Design a protein around this ligand. Sequence first.
Ligand SMILES: Cc1ccc([C@@H](NC(=O)Cc2ccc3c(c2)CCCC3)[C@@H](C)C(=O)O)cc1
Length: 293
Amino acid sequence: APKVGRLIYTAGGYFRQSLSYLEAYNPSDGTWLRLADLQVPRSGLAGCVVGGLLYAVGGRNNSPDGNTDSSALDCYNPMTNQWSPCAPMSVPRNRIGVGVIDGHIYAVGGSHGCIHHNSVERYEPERDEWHLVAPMLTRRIGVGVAVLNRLLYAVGGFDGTNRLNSAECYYPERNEWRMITAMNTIRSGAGVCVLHNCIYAAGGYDGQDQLNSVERYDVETETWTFVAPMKHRRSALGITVHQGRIYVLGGYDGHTFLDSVECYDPDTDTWSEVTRMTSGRSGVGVAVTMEPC
Ligand SMILES: Cc1ccc([C@@H](NC(=O)Cc2ccc3c(c2)CCCC3)[C@@H](C)C(=O)O)cc1
């Protein structure tokens, strides 16, 4: 499963305005690479990879000229260092979560103005088409999404009135969502990822404060268990998994836009500061794929 030449890509983000940055971090030598800007600045987007290509999904362009929620899907090829537009989603989705199953991109929840989506849609890259699938049981913006064992999980978020500790799972062969065990902590804008047989939820916002606590859901035992907390509390953070470790990137702690990048080692149950982003930002999209040419 592991292979050389893989980088952690971070796309977009927010700092006083939505950002167009695409930067790639190499954990092997600690270097950052500046790559082609997004065609449209976006915060609150999600990133994912299908067939070696990096996709930026949804978000919102917060600029002095206005605030525009994004239905866009854009594809970055590391072999060419170029972005290419894809077919747009059916609705704009800010503060979105995405997950990949069998080479298809699931776009989950998000906001459009004061509308809080429970709708979900699926992208087919070979046909460049989006199609709606079953909506979630709960409206969720700032939702964390991860895929384990070809099942799609939507974790936490904000429904328009309350931040959520609830979570649910999508079963594709049934086109059906079912609630799973609720988290021990209310988390909106948490970083959600998959490591081994567990869904991790790191950080987030409970309506009052940002969190440094981290918990993981064992899909076999159906229980949430806290692991070691991050050094820096954060919400609207980027997250990914690389070489069996969790990386959290940036975010907002209620006072400062973080440039901190922490790395979680599950064998030692410890977090370590590995690098800092070139500038503090929140609401990034993050994914791992091969290094560019
Ligand atoms: C991407 C994302 C996901 C979830 C959220 C959720 N809020 C937070 O985490 C608090 C937060 C986070 C970043 C920033 C601010 C506030 C205010 C200043 C600008 C940056 C949102 C749904 C909610 O619970 O109100 C925000 C953004």
